RNA sequence: AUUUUUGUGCCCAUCGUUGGCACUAUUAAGGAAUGGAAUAUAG
DNA sequence: TGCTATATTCCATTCCTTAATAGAACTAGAC
DNA sequence: GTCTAGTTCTATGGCAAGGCGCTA
């Protein structure tokens, strides 16, 4: 029901005097230095846990007792860390020696887990526990007693309480509530309710609870039974009855009884520690005197990875077990026959070192079609040996063999256009053994080998200490606050300064490390974004109300661009170039205050202060909870479709619609509202450039840059192509260079492709690497049109940074290639050319920031659109595509490289977070299957309706590639891709509609095909033919779903020619649409 | 408690007219891929 | 018109997932 | 009277394809 996230604001610390920053420095170093003591100590505690302690415990999520013991007795940690190493073969033996019993299957899978043998090892935490006992001189009896209470207090085990809590109950010396009194009270309430099981009013319940505590009021009840702490839910009933807010609430007595009965265990004992005094004295010797807030904040940072890895490794072991059980070990014998390939004459290789076989080695299941073809050739060669061939069968057999070989080579080449190329020799070998293993067992055997290697490599998570950070705030932490805006105003008035300024002060209680006592101290921060959105005061009387969503942002309805006074403008203009952007925002903010345009922000004690000290830098973060209540009564669905090269798209669908444009969709009345592209327009003068699609200036305007490129490449003309049986053909790069140097080609295309040419050049002049240095600098770093200075967020721009990366890589690789002492490292590269190494790093950092910006700007458009729709219609459900498992070893690495820049996941995760801050927005991801081929609002209403995608182009620009593609669609050969059939319908409808036959496309000269199309189009007075093409820009939709669609007669039916992606966004919106209103 | 010069970043043949924008921080591991040099193979 | 293919080693990278942190409500006692 | 510094709180579809571009 309730929803929570945080919004953080980064800030810059504005230091005070050396000596005051030294004091905070010292405190932060004290907390950091103490944290590993708590880590080591809790790891010792875990190692003491045992059957007796965990007996009859919840044990949730199907984790067995062995697993729970194992995860606490044994952990994979860095080799050089303090606990003692243990060998993997020993784990079961030690477990039995500590348990009394052999480890079950869960603990068994834990111990078999893969890990990096050179970084980490298993560690024996039980030995760590023994060392606690010996060093602190605790009895096993005493420690075990404390350990058991700690277990029931959730200080250890699988579901820990908060550090603040654990610290308090273990270490605090405040007055405790008497637990026996609460046991008596809880037991009595149970009794009285068992004696009256059929009450139905809270009134009745309240009176029974009071009777149980022998009291007239809530106040007396609390004082006697639950003096200190948050109010237990059973006393809450009474409180709320006196307040009169729970009168017409239901009473479910069996629950009440059950809940009370559950809490009883924790009140059977008083929490009288036997060992805590010694453990505190040890702690005081290492981290200094006990204080709740400091010990708590140190413990926080130690517990996080200890409990985190327990949760994660437990889940991981369980998954491993499921995954081993999906492995069909009954297929091992088939594996071995396939794996026999390596012992065969078809693969023989020096050192005879073999590798793991995978489905893509035989081309997935397509081997079945290859076997069908090979078997047809064989059967037909058999009768050709009986009747056709008589005595001279020495030439017919040789013919069979060549035909077998050819059918295979053809198969691998076919497969290898859209995937990794299957291994000729492995398929030759496998066909030699047709009699030993059936084709569906070749697949199952290969699958067995691949899946078994995959599951058995999965790595356990090692337990690594945290780099800590410490939290200050209002409640249950180290004490701190942001000076409230009103207190800011008061403070400045008292010191006789300006009402307002641009800095943010915190007051935090900190330990003076010299006195080891607490002192409150003020520190200064700066963050313009915090100023704008939160802190800067609306002082003007009668300001606009605080906004529904709290922060003062454009997305929340505050443009924050007021008309500046003359002096304000001149402050901007006179500010140093490095400070002008910040001052402009300050000015715009200050104007908005003066002109009563700045809305209120409702201050609370809602911001946590997080401090991370790295060297002498302090990183201070301010973060606040943002609360939301879901609103499932949706009025609009906003589909979103993610693309790589083209633009992302959205589509809005009104649900429960009425009036004009309504469509009946399986009894639900719906209406298309709109569809669109996601663009991020940035204005330079009167022009505007779409960050997401701009591919750079035409080379028209770049001739000096390109001439300067040309001038260089001429000096390194020479290359020599692949030795195709010792040919050594000449290679001029200028033929390639001139292909890209047109006035119509874009800067980013030119730069990218030039990187690839320079790369190749370098490979042909490996001893002359150093000479490319300066022109690499010019291209990437220094030039006015270099990669670092000009680049959009377009796909091509990201491919630019990638190829630049690769070029630098080529450079270093050839520069440091030995004439022919270990491999070349980043240490080595940086020393050989710091500037170039630094350039690799600046390219890396520039790319990350571009990626981050993209995610943020795309997400903003989606959320802005959704908010806009919410304001007109009511609640919006945003639906994106569930994208996973994109990059696979079975695909060509060029395909994987192309898919890597997709960012659908990163964009979607950002929408997720942003949505959590707005009433009336929800985000789900849906199955994207057939999303690009469905006829929206016709598909599933009621018939399945799928159609191909279409390219549109003039006859001049038809390529061989297009003609070939259209012919592949008219091919009779079946496929297991269900979309194939759509393209085949498309190609058939293509012929009919332009009055062609297969014979007019098939075989005839490309040029003649262009002519044939030209004659047909000209007679029809059309500029452009549509043809079916995978990935095509256009879709022939029934409804007009692209505001700019034109109509067409296609095979005697009328469709709108829509952008294929605007169509996809509506389909994404429609996926299981009926479920979002059931 | 006063620093008054900065929260992080994004775009451009014109880097400014107030140029135009956007944004949850951190810690750690794991998962799947990618680039470069070279080796071994079959083409 | 051509973007050779598989597999491995070593040095490097990016995109994403999943374990965590960024406590609430309270009161006795100190101002 | 406000606030600090301590305590205790917590609640009852099987697969596998599909979803992604080239420039020129």
Numbering used by the authors: 7 to 826, 834 to 1091
Give sentences from the paper.
Cas12i is a newly identified member of the functionally diverse type V CRISPR-Cas effectors. Among them, Cas12i is characterized by a relatively smaller size (1033-1093aa) compared with Cas12a. Cas12i has substantially different efficiencies in cutting two strands of target DNA, which results in a nicking activity that could be utilized to develop a double-nicking approach for genome editing with high specificity. In Cas12i1, the REC lobe consists of the Helical-I domain and the PAM-interacting (PI) domain, whereas the NUC lobe comprises the Wedge (WED), Helical-II, RuvC, and Nuc domains.
To obtain these crystal structures, the crystal structure of the selenomethionine (SeMet)-labeled wild-type Cas12i1 ternary complex was solved using the single-wavelength anomalous diffraction method. Next, the SeMet-labeled model was used to solve the crystal structures of two unlabeled ternary complexes using the molecular replacement method. In the pre-cleavage R-loop complex, the two strands of target DNA are unwound beyond the PAM duplex and the TD strand forms a 19-bp heteroduplex with the crRNA guide region. The NTD strand extends from the PAM duplex and is partially exposed to the surrounding solvent. The nucleotides dT(4*)–dA(6*) of the NTD strand are disordered and invisible due to the flexibility, and the nucleotides dA(7*)–dG(20*) pass through the channel formed by the Helical-I, Helical-II, RuvC, and Nuc domains. The structure of the pre-cleavage R-loop complex displays how the NTD strand is accommodated within the RuvC active site. Side chains of three catalytic residues D647 (virtual modeling of A647D), E894, and D1074 in the RuvC domain point toward the phosphate group between the nucleotides dG(15*) and dC(16*), implying this position as the possible cutting site in the NTD strand.
